[PDB]
Symmetry: D4
């Protein structure tokens, strides 16, 4: 299961969150960004349940995460060169 998750942090907590994210195997990329969202992660998990558990029970429970917006990727419309 694949998704891109847009994260907003508490004001000023973006670097600390990025640091946490780096260590997790399900996070295949992570970037802090300018604009309306603060961090963009690509998440690859073994199943849709494991994606859900990861989003709800890890990412959304990390210190200083405020909100997440998970964009489920369409199977067959996804390319990483």
């Amino acid at each position: 299961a694949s998704a891109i998750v847009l994260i907003n942090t508490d004001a000023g907590g973006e670097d600390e969150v990025f640091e946490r994210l780096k260590s997790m195997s399900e996070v295949t990329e992570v970037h802090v960004v300018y604009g309306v969202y603060d961090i963009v992660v690509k998440v690859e998990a073994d199943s849709m349940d494991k994606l859900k558990d990861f989003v709800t029970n890890t990412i959304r429970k990390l210190p200083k995460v405020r909100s997440t917006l998970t964009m489920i990727i369409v199977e067959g419309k996804s390319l990483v060169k």
Copy 2:
């Protein structure tokens, strides 16, 4: 220069736009997604001027692209495993 671009298309045009983007050398990854955005692209250009020229004169002049939201990725806070 690196950025993630959140694209909205005209309703129904997402597959057409996807296929256009995939063949562009500045586009390193592209995904159709469920939610408030339709396509997520990661763009890598040689310079910020070349990123601007790519976003404005290629991506945003594609048929059926309605809007774009470019998130400039912060140098030194960007990991692809």
Copy 3:
């Protein structure tokens, strides 16, 4: 009176809120969802006043409810097969 309520939760609270909602008689359906909203609920109440009281005094007083967006359904433009 009937409505669909889009709920946002505090980060990580969406399963808990989902569980509280599921057991309430006015809730005819409830779903955790990916994207900009966390929980969608269909509410059926005997009147508009009881809809009001349910939204404000039950839904919006649940722990870890951050926001709600109640969409009143139009009488005569509503089908459940």
Copy 4:
């Protein structure tokens, strides 16, 4: 495969879109609504590919459909009474 799709129509086209939506078998419920969205549909498709195809090539190609926001429902966190 199940989703709740939030639709905006071109101004004034909501009743016509509603009537088109109601006769589709993948649409198990459809409601015109007050607020920032115009119609709410629950879609039940046999698979995630059939969901994508119904969203992109049916819903998003209907006349007067301006935008959609598909919310993928979380398996195991979904109840219709």
Copy 5:
């Protein structure tokens, strides 16, 4: 039945739409405004069905209306001094 409708217009059409709205009996007040919305209107109709018909068939069929967001007012939580 009563509501406040937030209207967005096509760029440059807000004075024209304002003028069409002003003369209609269901409109009890109307204002062009700065910000994310263009026009605020208070609507008072004899019933919820007539509210519906007014929003969809008058407001949303006005030339240069792009979008509307109708906020139904809660009975018993409404004061005009």
Copy 6:
């Protein structure tokens, strides 16, 4: 000086905020509403400074007021019947 202010409260505090708002002389009308906003107020102040001060130091300091969106009404494009 006239404005329409859209208020969001902390979840569940809308009735308490409404009662506080209704006794203020600068508030000429106040309504709790369904949708993305929770309360709508029209504010009439003697001047733009008095508007600012009432928005910042009264409304935005009320307990359970989370955010406001003040829409400055355009002089000459405003009618209350």
Copy 7:
């Protein structure tokens, strides 16, 4: 009268719009930008009527302007070093 106006253009029309904006005396600054808006202008006009006329009758009528969001600046809370 002072304001900052956030402009969204038709996809790809941002440079052409920026070029138009440069020539107008009421526009004291203009910038194209990455993210959810496309151009940021500072507008200084002689009065609130002249601000309104400029926004509605010039900026919002320019080719390829799609939307504008005008943020009225608070007198006494405005500094340009």
Copy 8:
């Protein structure tokens, strides 16, 4: 490096935040505004790294700053008369 930052504060904190920002040498202009954002700041830093460090460790660690939206200004599409 140049950017315009759209700031939201805790309700009522806008004047406090304004006064904090005004004295910072990276802040070249600052305005409190009516609407969906509360403060607009223009930031000029010597480098993109210094912009990031300024946004994350100064602006977004100010008391009562709730969120920020940094719009990176496009080099060569930026005029201050």
